[PDB]
Amino acid sequence: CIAVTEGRKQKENPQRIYAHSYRVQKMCFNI
Amino acid sequence: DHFTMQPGVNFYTVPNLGPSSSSADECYTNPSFSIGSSIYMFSQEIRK
Amino acid sequence: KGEIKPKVSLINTAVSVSIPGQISNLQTKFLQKYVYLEESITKQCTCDKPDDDTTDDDKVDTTIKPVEYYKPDGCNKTNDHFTMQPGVNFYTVPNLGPSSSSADECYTNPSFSIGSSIYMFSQEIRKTDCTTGEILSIQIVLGRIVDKGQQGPQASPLLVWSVPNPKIINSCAVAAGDETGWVLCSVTLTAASGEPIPHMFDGFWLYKFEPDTEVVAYRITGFAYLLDKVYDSVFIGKGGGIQRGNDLYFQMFGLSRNRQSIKALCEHGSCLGTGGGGYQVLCDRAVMSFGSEESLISNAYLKVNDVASGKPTIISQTFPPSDSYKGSNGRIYTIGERYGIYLAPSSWNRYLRFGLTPDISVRSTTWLKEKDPIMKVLTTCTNTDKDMCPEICNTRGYQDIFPLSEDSSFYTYIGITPSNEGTKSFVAVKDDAGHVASITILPNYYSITSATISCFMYKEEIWCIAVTEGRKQKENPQRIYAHSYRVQKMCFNI
Amino acid sequence: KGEIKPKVSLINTAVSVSIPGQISNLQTKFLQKYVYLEESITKQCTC
Numbered sequence: 001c002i003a004v005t006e007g008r009k010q011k012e013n014p015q016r017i018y019a020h021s022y023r024v025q026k027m028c029f030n031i
Numbered sequence: 032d033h034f035t036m037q038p039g040v041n042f043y044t045v046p047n048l049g050p051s052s053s054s055a056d057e058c059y060t061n062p063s064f065s066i067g068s069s070i071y072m073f074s075q076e077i078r079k
Numbered sequence: 080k081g082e083i084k085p086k087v088s089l090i091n092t093a094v095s096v097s098i099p100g101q102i103s104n105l106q107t108k109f110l111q112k113y114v115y116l117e118e119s120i121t122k123q124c125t126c127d128k129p130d131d132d133t134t135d136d137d138k139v140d141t142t143i144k145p146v147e148y149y150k151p152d153g154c155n156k157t158n159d160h161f162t163m164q165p166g167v168n169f170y171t172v173p174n175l176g177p178s179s180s181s182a183d184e185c186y187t188n189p190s191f192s193i194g195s196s197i198y199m200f201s202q203e204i205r206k207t208d209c210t211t212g213e214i215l216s217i218q219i220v221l222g223r224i225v226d227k228g229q230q231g232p233q234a235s236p237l238l239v240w241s242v243p244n245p246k247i248i249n250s251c252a253v254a255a256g257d258e259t260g261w262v263l264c265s266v267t268l269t270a271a272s273g274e275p276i277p278h279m280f281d282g283f284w285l286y287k288f289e290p291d292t293e294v295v296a297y298r299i300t301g302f303a304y305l306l307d308k309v310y311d312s313v314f315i316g317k318g319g320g321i322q323r324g325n326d327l328y329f330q331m332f333g334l335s336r337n338r339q340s341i342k343a344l345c346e347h348g349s350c351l352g353t354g355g356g357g358y359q360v361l362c363d364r365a366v367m368s369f370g371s372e373e374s375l376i377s378n379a380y381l382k383v384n385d386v387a388s389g390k391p392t393i394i395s396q397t398f399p400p401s402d403s404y405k406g407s408n409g410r411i412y413t414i415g416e417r418y419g420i421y422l423a424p425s426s427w428n429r430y431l432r433f434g435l436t437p438d439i440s441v442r443s444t445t446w447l448k449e450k451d452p453i454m455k456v457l458t459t460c461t462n463t464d465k466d467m468c469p470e471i472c473n474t475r476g477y478q479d480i481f482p483l484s485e486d487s488s489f490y491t492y493i494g495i496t497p498s499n500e501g502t503k504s505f506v507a508v509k510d511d512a513g514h515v516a517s518i519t520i521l522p523n524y525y526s527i528t529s530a531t532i533s534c535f536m537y538k539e540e541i542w543c544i545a546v547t548e549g550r551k552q553k554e555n556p557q558r559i560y561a562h563s564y565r566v567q568k569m570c571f572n573i
Numbered sequence: 574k575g576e577i578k579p580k581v582s583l584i585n586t587a588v589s590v591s592i593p594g595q596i597s598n599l600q601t602k603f604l605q606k607y608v609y610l611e612e613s614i615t616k617q618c619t620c
């Protein structure tokens with residue numbers, strides 16, 4: 001999955017747009 | 032059995048999705064992002 | 080302007096950075112699989128990344144990372160000596176910055192800095208003579224260190240820029256942080272005719288460079304800076320500077336006016352000769368400029384505050400004459416959680432001047448007791464190396480060191496020795512016990528006059544790149560060259 | 574002639590020289606490793 005966000009890296013920086021990627025994993029727990 | 036899906040541990044970066052600028056009086060706002068079969072569309076507004 | 084240029088920049092970035100990284104990753108995986116196959120073959124036949132998490136996830140390129148000092152683990156239990164020694168080879172690092180074949184032009188005063196994954200480079204082009212020649216241009220390069228198919232690391236320039244109004248600039252330097260480069264330049268007072276008044280002070284200029292963006296210029300003058308002493312002229316140390324947090328740190332030197340008593344630092348070993356207190360008088364006069372006690376040449380820490388806000392300000396701290404010799408070019412280093420300063424030799428002491436401070440303060444700086452790098456070129460001084468006799472002389476040269484340990488007990492440097500024709504140069508590593516491991520370098524080249532070293536982590540080892548200035552042949556004009564070497568650890572047992 | 578031309582020259586150098594050398598070095602290393610693998614197979618799984 002890819003996520004697009006707004007934000008500022010530093011407190012006094014102007015707003016910008018960033019993008020990051022992550023993986024969703026199947027799991028099978030046993031209780 | 033409990034079938035579950037969980038988020039992965041790393042949050043990688045995707046550099047250069049769209050062009051940016053170093054000006055300090057411009058704000059990039061209101062992105063619109065969509066992914067198709069093989070292509071992606073991205074939209075942004077610059078406001079002063 | 081709208082279509083061709085951004086796409087050309089994208090093509091340059093993709094062919095110079097991305098594809099080499101992809102191929103290097105493929106090769107690394109191939110070798111790993113081969114090793115695994117060999118191990119399985121030997122074993123069977125008869126007769127996921129939490130450490131990389133929050134570490135390399137935010138990095139665009141993972142070729143290099145900041146240095147991580149070697150540890151004596153394993154070496155310790157048997158009586159043993161743990162030592163670091165230089166690699167045998169000194170590979171070229173071609174096209175670090177653009178060059179020219181003009182014979183009237185000299186490339187001088189290089190400034191080199193390495194960030195997290197980017198590098199910043201600066202050079203001056205002066206007509207005719209290197210020292211007192213008109214500044215034709217000042218060129219800045221921002222790039223990345225990448226792994227091509229060659230043995231050593233390589234450099235890929237990403238942005239080349241020319242400083243506006245080069246004539247009115249006294250001197251300046253560069254610093255590198257993650258995805259960011261900074262250039263601090265000092266200007267002089269120009270008035271009346273357009274020709275600048277040499278060796279004056281009129282403020283600073285600060286330039287910020289980021290990848291695939293436009294350079295940002297800030298003017299620091301008037302009430303935006305507060306130096307602790309009245310400086311007639313201000314120069315920025317060619318070594319460079321560093322960024323910590325929202326603040327930058329540089330070294331400066333220049334003419335400063337004072338009215339107090341002067342007792343210049345006088346450390347030397349059994350000079351004898353005349354003596355009788357005349358050495359103290361010579362030491363006091365050396366730091367003076369043109370004899371008058373009013374004006375001295377002073378060294379100073381320089382601090383730039385709130386760079387992210389958009390209104391940077393500058394403060395400074397001046398070294399007293401009792402704790403220093405005459406001002407010269409310097410460099411600021413971050414070692415571990417503490418910082419260091421290297422001061423080049425100008426005047427009679429020609430030993431190495433390195434100091435360690437935890438908070439970048441004048442009153443909390445302690446100097447190393449090591450003499451290993453001794454400048455023997457570009458000096459008019461006549462005192463012997465064994466004992467440094469106070470004398471009035473000028474030395475113009477730059478050879479810095481890179482600490483390889485938290486307390487700077489290990490370090491690497493480059494030594495240059497004058498000869499009948501040109502100079503002879505070697506690269507050396509200095510350990511705790513007092514031993515030097517040396518390898519001669521650049522045999523073909525005629526002469527080398529300076530060297531600056533910066534080290535990093537590359538392929539699970541410490542690699543260093545040295546930027547020197549010199550002449551390949553006797554009649555060629557002076558140019559600047561970059562080469563790479565590795566530092567390898569050893570556990571010798573006696 | 575201030576920006577575009579040097580970048581074009583750099584791209585030409587990158588595509589004509591560096592990348593072919595990297596790919597050739599990869600192939601050379603791969604062939605050497607295959608030779609070593611065959612030698613070790615013959616030496617060890619001979620039985």
Ligand SMILES: *[C@@H]1O[C@H](CO)[C@@H](O)[C@H](O)[C@H]1NC(C)=O
Nearest residue numbers: 156157158159160571572573
């Ligand atoms: C300790 O050093 C001595 C010589 O100084 C050497 O002969 C001896 O082998 C060393 N100890 C070991 C077990 O390495």
Ligand code: NA
Nearest residue numbers: 109112113116
């Ligand atoms: Na394999």
Ligand code: NA
Nearest residue numbers: 113606607610
């Ligand atoms: Na193989």
Ligand code: NA
Nearest residue numbers: 603606607610
């Ligand atoms: Na193979």
